[PDB]
Each structure stands twice: as structure tokens, then as C-alpha cells.
Amino acid sequence: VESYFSDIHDFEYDKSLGSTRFFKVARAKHREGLVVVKVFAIQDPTLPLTSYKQELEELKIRLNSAQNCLPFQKASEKASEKAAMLFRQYVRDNLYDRISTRPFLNNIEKRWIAFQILTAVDQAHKSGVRHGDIKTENVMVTSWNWVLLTDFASFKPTYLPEDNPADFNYFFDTSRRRTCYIAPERFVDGGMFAQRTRGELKRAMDIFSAGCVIAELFTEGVPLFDLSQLLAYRNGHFFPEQVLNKIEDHSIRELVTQMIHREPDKRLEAEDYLKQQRGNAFPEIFYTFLQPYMAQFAKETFLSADERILVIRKDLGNIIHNLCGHDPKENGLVILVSVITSCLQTLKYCDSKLAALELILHLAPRLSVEILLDRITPYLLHFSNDSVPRVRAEALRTLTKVLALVKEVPRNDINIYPEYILPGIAHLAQDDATIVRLAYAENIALLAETALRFLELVQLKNLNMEND
Amino acid sequence: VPDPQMSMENLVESKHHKLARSLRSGPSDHDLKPNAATRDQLNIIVSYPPTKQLTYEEQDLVWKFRYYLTNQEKALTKFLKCVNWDLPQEAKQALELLGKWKPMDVEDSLELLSSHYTNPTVRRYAVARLRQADDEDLLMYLLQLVQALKYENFDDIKNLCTFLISRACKNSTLANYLYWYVIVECEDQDTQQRDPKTHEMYLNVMRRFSQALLKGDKSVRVMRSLLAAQQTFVDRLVHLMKAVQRESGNRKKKNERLQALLGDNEKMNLSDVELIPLPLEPQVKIRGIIPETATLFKSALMPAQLFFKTEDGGKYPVIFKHGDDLRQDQLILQIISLMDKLLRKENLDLKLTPYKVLATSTKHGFMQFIQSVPVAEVLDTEGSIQNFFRKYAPSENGPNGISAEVMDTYVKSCAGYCVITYILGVGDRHLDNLLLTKTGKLFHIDFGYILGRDPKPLPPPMKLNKEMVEGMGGTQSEQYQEFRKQCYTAFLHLRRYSNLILNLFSLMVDANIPDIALEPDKTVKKVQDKFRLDLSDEEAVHYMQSLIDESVHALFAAVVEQIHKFAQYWRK
Numbered sequence A: 001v002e003s004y005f006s007d008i009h010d011f012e013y014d015k016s017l018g019s020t021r022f023f024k025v026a027r028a029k030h031r032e033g034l035v036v037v038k039v040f041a042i043q044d045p046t047l048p049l050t051s052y053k054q055e056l057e058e059l060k061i062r063l064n065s066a067q068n069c070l071p072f073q074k075a076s077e078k079a080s081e082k083a084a085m086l087f088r089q090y091v092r093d094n095l096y097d098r099i100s101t102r103p104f105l106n107n108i109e110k111r112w113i114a115f116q117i118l119t120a121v122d123q124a125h126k127s128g129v130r131h132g133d134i135k136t137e138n139v140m141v142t143s144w145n146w147v148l149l150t151d152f153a154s155f156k157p158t159y160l161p162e163d164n165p166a167d168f169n170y171f172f173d174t175s176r177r178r179t180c181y182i183a184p185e186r187f188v189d190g191g192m193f194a195q196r197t198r199g200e201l202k203r204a205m206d207i208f209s210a211g212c213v214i215a216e217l218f219t220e221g222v223p224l225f226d227l228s229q230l231l232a233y234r235n236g237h238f239f240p241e242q243v244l245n246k247i248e249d250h251s252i253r254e255l256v257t258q259m260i261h262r263e264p265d266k267r268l269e270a271e272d273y274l275k276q277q278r279g280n281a282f283p284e285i286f287y288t289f290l291q292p293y294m295a296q297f298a299k300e301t302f303l304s305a306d307e308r309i310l311v312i313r314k315d316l317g318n319i320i321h322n323l324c325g326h327d328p329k330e331n332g333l334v335i336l337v338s339v340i341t342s343c344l345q346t347l348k349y350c351d352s353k354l355a356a357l358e359l360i361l362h363l364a365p366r367l368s369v370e371i372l373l374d375r376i377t378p379y380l381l382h383f384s385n386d387s388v389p390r391v392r393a394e395a396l397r398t399l400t401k402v403l404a405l406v407k408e409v410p411r412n413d414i415n416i417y418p419e420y421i422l423p424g425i426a427h428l429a430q431d432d433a434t435i436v437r438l439a440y441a442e443n444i445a446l447l448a449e450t451a452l453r454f455l456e457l458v459q460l461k462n463l464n465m466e467n468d
Numbered sequence B: 001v002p003d004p005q006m007s008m009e010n011l012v013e014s015k016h017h018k019l020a021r022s023l024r025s026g027p028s029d030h031d032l033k034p035n036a037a038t039r040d041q042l043n044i045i046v047s048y049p050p051t052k053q054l055t056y057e058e059q060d061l062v063w064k065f066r067y068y069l070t071n072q073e074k075a076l077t078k079f080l081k082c083v084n085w086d087l088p089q090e091a092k093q094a095l096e097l098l099g100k101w102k103p104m105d106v107e108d109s110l111e112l113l114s115s116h117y118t119n120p121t122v123r124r125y126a127v128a129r130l131r132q133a134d135d136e137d138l139l140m141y142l143l144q145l146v147q148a149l150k151y152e153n154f155d156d157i158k159n160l161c162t163f164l165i166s167r168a169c170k171n172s173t174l175a176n177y178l179y180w181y182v183i184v185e186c187e188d189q190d191t192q193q194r195d196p197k198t199h200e201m202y203l204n205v206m207r208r209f210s211q212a213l214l215k216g217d218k219s220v221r222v223m224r225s226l227l228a229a230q231q232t233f234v235d236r237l238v239h240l241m242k243a244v245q246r247e248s249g250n251r252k253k254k255n256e257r258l259q260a261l262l263g264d265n266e267k268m269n270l271s272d273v274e275l276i277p278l279p280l281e282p283q284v285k286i287r288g289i290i291p292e293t294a295t296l297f298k299s300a301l302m303p304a305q306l307f308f309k310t311e312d313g314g315k316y317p318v319i320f321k322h323g324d325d326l327r328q329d330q331l332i333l334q335i336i337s338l339m340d341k342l343l344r345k346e347n348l349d350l351k352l353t354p355y356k357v358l359a360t361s362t363k364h365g366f367m368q369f370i371q372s373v374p375v376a377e378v379l380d381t382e383g384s385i386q387n388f389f390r391k392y393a394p395s396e397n398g399p400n401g402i403s404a405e406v407m408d409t410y411v412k413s414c415a416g417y418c419v420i421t422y423i424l425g426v427g428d429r430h431l432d433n434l435l436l437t438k439t440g441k442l443f444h445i446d447f448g449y450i451l452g453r454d455p456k457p458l459p460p461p462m463k464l465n466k467e468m469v470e471g472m473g474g475t476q477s478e479q480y481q482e483f484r485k486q487c488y489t490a491f492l493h494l495r496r497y498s499n500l501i502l503n504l505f506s507l508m509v510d511a512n513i514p515d516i517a518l519e520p521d522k523t524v525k526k527v528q529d530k531f532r533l534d535l536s537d538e539e540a541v542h543y544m545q546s547l548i549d550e551s552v553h554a555l556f557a558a559v560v561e562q563i564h565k566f567a568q569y570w571r572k
């Protein structure tokens, strides 16, 4: 696949993302950033690729305004005499990887990811776009838990013969995972099959695909249907009861069950599911503030990591009022922490670095102990290596105050103090900058006392657990 | 949507790495969920073929992540292979993890009964996995399950075993297939000489089966009486075959003797026998043999065509072969039946024709007859396969003058047999072993050369003959392309189940099938080589296509068939 990038001077090959008979996917560097390139090797030049290119350009125009929809931004018919190439923006993680990459998505993050998937389907339907290949591998999640459905593959065949499915390995099974998120109605009886490559997709078809993608997220990376179980579903010989019984959240389970329904007449519109689960599977905070506020960060106008921190700092008072009220309100804050944490690694200005620390100090008293130790604690030690001495001192001040709020130690952080907290700030006690050593001397007593409080709690918990 | 953290280190993951890497933190493997990198490596490990030697790193990782691997039903086989049974502490953990795993597929559960799993808690468990399979699946594996007795502890039988026996007492179809399999091993004199403990064991197995049936009710005793009747019937056929075999003369004299002896109920009691379930197919109940239709074929072993009288007055055709070791065919045809079942599992109906084979002794048994015409006769009488099909399945609207549906069955069946014959490496590719039906079904006969044994110089790699290609309409026909597409489909589908095929062949290493017994340690390995699991899907399809080109350009294949035809003409 990398050999195909040698002819594209604006894209520098980086890594291979996958190879199938239909599409070879690789990541490349471009002046705009990282991009995913799916390369279709043209074996027969008589194929009407111009018709498909026009369809892709139509998709780009139709999906340009969707915030949760990522169409193919570029389609090159004759990029090289050997292959046609499709280009789109690279997203940090695909949903398939995101499930296994730490921090593990909390219940509030799982609800938020599901909500964004439904919003992506609703937006695509109103924009006149149908996906046709809705699977957990196509629902992307950004560093701030913003979901972007990508890889609109209108070139894939819509209909597959039920009796001769082997012809679907190049059209539908490029990844060899045997996972099938195709709507049941898209398998059709082979006596018809022996323009379904692009038969006009019913909206109920996308709802089916979204249900399989939404299901994989709720099944801990467990696929909802295998080829045998799915074909058996269409023929009534298979039902993924084991995997569906695996959706622990009753509110999320109901939404998933209905969307992957075999009969198209039972599938609702995307907007209806959001309304049906509004206040149940999706808390009201997602629609009224999370979606409108967060949409500002997924806009075409690029907010630098420094600008994002200042924007969040400016709105901090409003965010706390909108998420906590005057007062389950903590459920929204897990999602809020994700916006700040996605920026701390790219901050460039000292003004922003201090601002990022101010946000952490103000949010820290309002987060759950699990979130404090898992999502906040790792970033403060990162800031402790910042080039600004004032920042190194403040990092120690922030870390000292944040840790004093930890009243419960998660099972994964029982040895966090001797191996992460204490060893993580130990380098500060000898920093070259007197302000850093001063911040160290001013806090070394507090850090030790905080670690001691942790050890006493672990010992009490162990004594109680031994007496359980 | 510009993301700032695109190229930056995952600080949250790095944190958990420092705590999980700490030697002070005691292994909390119960809550450990693997990260994406570990999952991708883990998926490769759980997918390894049973012949691949596992490194030490996988066992420690799987143990470290033992509480994580508990969600993969297929990983129980790999996890237990990593556990060092020599450490009792690790064993206690290994046995503890086994009890929590999601129950694996029965197709994979056959692997736990092989000789490699020696732990009694593990073997009683392996029986607990087989305990959930339906009898309809068990009947497809009973041939392998009985071979699996080669790996069980002989002492418990003399004193897992209770499970296999318990199912047979309830379903007569299984009891029939089990019974003949146990009888075949109880008569294998070679096993008595090579492993007398096992032969005596098989005597105990045949005896034990009788003891379990004896304790049943009158209906079960009736079931027993039917088996006793079955024994007499097969014995009569063997004696008849000896009487017919002793008659020196032309086929007509032997045929008359065979029919007269079958007719002579007073001496042979074969024309009218008590009600017996047919040895070839225990689902069909029979009343006797039709004497007038029994005929001897012109093969060196002169097989007997026998028509059995069914309870409803119908005719069920069976072939009794004497002088050939049908155990190889019995296993192979079981493998063919299994390959066919897997393709149908994916809705890929290759229209396979799995003819039934049953070894009744180490030298003779019953085999189902499938309506077909020998290719040697078709080529001599009609000139081309198209002329043959035009005579038997004429369709004015179909491809090449053959009904499109008939042509579809022919293309699918040709592809199915073509793929299975490549997978099994059938060597005896003489025109006498290919049978073509009027309905388009294609099936292979006389598997005298298997596992790559080919006496001929430079054999073609895949069984695709020029007449077979001309049968599909040529290199320019739509059916030839449809055939190739089905081959790629079947190759990829079977490549996915190469683990099941290698699991079954592993249980047959101690099974004295001529081609397995030649290199028993390599038997399971030979099947893996045919799955070509080392190639990617793109390379495998590229390889299969290259294979058709390499097979089509093998000019020498036509010369060897003409030399063999000349030798057969002189022998006739």
C-alpha cells in the first residue's frame, strides 16, 4: 500500500492500516495532518469509476454540513494509472480500538458514545446520506469523545446473495473479522442475484447497521452478529441472544435491541430513538448542553490546545452550573474532564499552562475518586516536566491539592503512591529552578502526609475486606 | 475536527503501565483487561493452529491476563495449553480459570479429548463440553470420538466413558454408527499386534458397550437383538463373498452364483432375513437382500451391488466391498461430509454429494451407491461432457443447452469436489474415479491414493481435467468464472475452519488409516499444509488462481491417462 503513496507528493506514507481484496487502508501525513487513504486497485480500466467518483462527490456535498458525519473529502479517479484513491481526515481512534484503550469508557462515556452514534445517523438521514456499512469499525471517536462516522463507502455493493455469500468477502469482509453489521434486508435470495450494488438504501437499513455498531460498544468489543448468526437471523435460524444478554445497561440494551431489528418496518428513524431515550438511556444534559457546547470544538474553525483551555476556563463557571446545577449530576462531569485532558498535552503558552492547572483545581473537588486517580492524576505529573518553572511549581501545588481530596483509592491504584505519586514528583525535590525546589519544600510535607493518609485507608480497607 | 492529542503519548495508559509493571503490586489478574496492543497479539495467539509450537511468552501472558481471556470461548483451548501442569499452584489456578470460561463450541471441544489433555479434571471437563452437543452433530464426529478412545485411560473402562455411552442408549441412529465403529476396532488384528493393551481395550470396549445395552429395558434388549441380527447378516455377506470369491470363472458365473446364493434362503438365509437396521444407514430398517439384482463389478475386488428390502417395500441400494480397506474411505468420507456441513453452515451450498461409507470389518463393509455414470463410459460414448449433459439435462433456456439450474448444481458440485480434492490431495485421478450424474452432481470414487501419494511423474496440483473444464463451457464461459468464484469462496471458508480440520486429523494420528499410518505424526500436519494458513487472504486467492493456471498448463496429465487406459484395456 505504501508504494501507492510514492505518486502523491502531498501525502507522505506513515503506516499501513489494513489490506483486503476490496480496499487497502493506510495512514499518511498531509499538510492538514493525518489522513486515512483507502486505495482501490484498478484491475479492469473499463470499470465506470467516473460514475462512482461522481457519487462520492455528491456524498461530499451532501455531508459537508453534518457535524457528526465525515464523508470522503477527496476521490481521485486517475491518481495513478494503477489505482483510484479516496482521502478523508484521520481520527485518533476507531471505535474498535477505543474500547480497549485506557482510560476505560465509563457508563457516562458509553452513553455519550451511543448518543453520538444515533445523532450521526439522524443527521445523515436528514442530509440525504445513508451509510450502508455501519459497524463499530467505522464509528470513530476523537480524543474528546466526539464521535465521527467516517468511511462513507457508497461504492460497496448494497445487496448480497443469500445463497452465494462468498462474493461478499471483497465487498463486505475486507477485515477478515467475520463481523457483519449489514442490515438483514440487504441479504437477498440468490435466485434474484445469479443494480443491487447501489440499490437505494432505506433509512431502516442504517438503523440496523447502527444497532450492530451500538451493540459492539455495549458488548465490551464483543460483536453483535457473526456471519452464521446474522444469516441465521435473516432466515430465522440465528438470534444473538447471548451477546444481547451481554448488554448490562437495561436502558442501553432496549435501544440496541430495536435498532438491529431484522424487519425494516420495525426500525424507527434516528430522531425518534433520541427522543424515546431522552432522559432514559441518554441524560437530558447530553442534548441541552453537551451536544451544543461540545459542537464548538468539532467545528472547522481550529481551536489550538491553548485556545481550548482558555475557552474551557472562561466557561468553567457556566459548565459547573450547567452540569451540577446549584446542587447523578456527577455523571456529566466524567464527560467534561475529557475535554480538558485532551488538550493538556498540546498546550503551548505559559498563560494556558497555568489556566489548565486552574481548571483541574476547580474541577478536582467535583469528580469521583476513580476519575481523579485515573483521568486527572496522570496529567499533573505530565505538566511537572514542563519547560516553564512556574508551571513545574504549580504542577506540584496542583498535584498536592488534588491528591488531598482522594478519600477512596481505586483497586488499580493501591500501589499508586509508592510507584507513581512519590516516584513521580521525586524529581522535583532537586529541580534546577529555585521556584521548583521552593514549591517542593513547601509541599513535600503535604505530599508525604497525603500518601500516609492513603496507606492508612488501604490498611483499613484491607482489614475490613479480610473480615468480610 | 483538529484533535490536539493526535500524536501524543497516552498518559492515562502510561500511568496504568507503571502500576501494572510494578513487582510490588501483586498479580490482580482477575480484573486485568488487555489493552489494544495486547488484544491484537492475543487474537493471533488464540487463532494458532494446533500444530504450532507455543512460546513461553503466551502462557505467562494468558495467565497474567487469565481473568481477561475468560470472555473468549475459543481461548479455553489456548489458555489450557499454556498452563504448566507441573506447578501445583499454577494448576489450581489453571483448573479455576477453566470453570469460568464461556462454554466453547462443540466443534472445538473435540480437541480436548485428544491424547494431549491428560488432566482428569480436564478430561472429565472435556466430556462435559461434549455433553452439550446435539446427537445430530455427534453422529458426524462419532468416528473421531471412537478414535479418541485411543487417548483415554484404559483403567476406567476396566473398572468421560459414561458420557459417550449414555447418549447411545437413547438414540438408535448413534448406537448404529457407534456399534460398527467399535466392532471395526475390535477386529483390527494389526492393533492387537502393535498395541495389545489397546486391542484388549477394544475387546473391553465392545464388551462394555454390550454390558450397557444389556442393562437396558426390553426395547433396548430388542435394540440389542437387532445388533445380534446385524452381526449374523454381515457374517452371511462375508461367507457369501468367500463362496462367490472361491468360484473361479467369468463375471456371469459369479453373478449367477451370487444371485442364486442370495436367493437360496435355506442355505444362506439372505433372501429372507429377520428385521435388521441396515449397517450402511441405521435410520433405514430392512427385511432382507434382493437376490436377483446382486451383481459383481469388474473391479479387481469385484464389489457386490446389493439392493436391500425396506420395511415399506422399497429398495435401498448398498455396495459391499471385499478385499479393500474401507476404513480410509470411511474417515475420508466423514471428512468430506464434515467439509460439506461447514460450507452449508455459512449458507454456501456447494451441492456436495457425500456418499456414505461404512467399514464393517478391517477388510469389508457397506457403502452407499449414488446414481452416476462412469466418466470412462461417458467419454467413450458421448465424446464430451456437454454431449452427456445435453442428453440428460436438456434446457433450451439454459447455459450451453443444459438447464441453468442443472448447470448451477454442476458448477457448485464441481467446485465443491474440486476444492475438497485439492484440500485432501487426492492422487488416484484416473477417469474411473470421477462419476457424473444426470442431475449435475459430481462425486469421487476409489480413494486408493490420498495424502499426496501419486505413482505418476509430475502430477497436476488440482483435480481439474480438460474434460471437466470443457464440461463448464471452456475458459471463455460464464460457468468457468462462476466455478472459480466458488473455489475462492470455499477456500476462504475452509481456511477459516482449518482449526477444526486439524483438530479432527490430530485425533486420527493413532488411527491406522493407510495414508495416516504411513506418517502418523505428520498426518495432522499434512492437513494444515492444505489449509495454507501461512498465506494472507489475498495471497491465498492469488495462489488458488495461480494454481488453476499451473494445473491447466500441465500438458503431461493427458499422456498419463492414455497410458493408464492402454494398461486397463489389456487387463480387461
Ligand SMILES: Nc1nc2c(ncn2[C@@H]2O[C@H](COP(=O)(O)OP(=O)(O)OP(=O)(O)O)[C@@H](O)[C@H]2O)c(=O)[nH]1
Binding pocket: A017, A018, A023, A025, A036, A089, A090, A091, A092, A093, A094, A095, A096, A097, A133, A134, A135, A136, A137, A138, A150, A151, A153, A174, A175
Ligand atoms: N485508530 C484508528 N483506526 C482507524 C482509523 N481509520 C481506520 N481505522 C481502523 O482500521 C481498520 C480499517 O478498515 P475499514 O475498511 O475502515 O473497516 P470497516 O469499517 O469494517 O469497513 P468500512 O465499512 O468499509 O469502512 C478498521 O479497524 C478501522 O477501524 C483511524 O483513523 N484511527
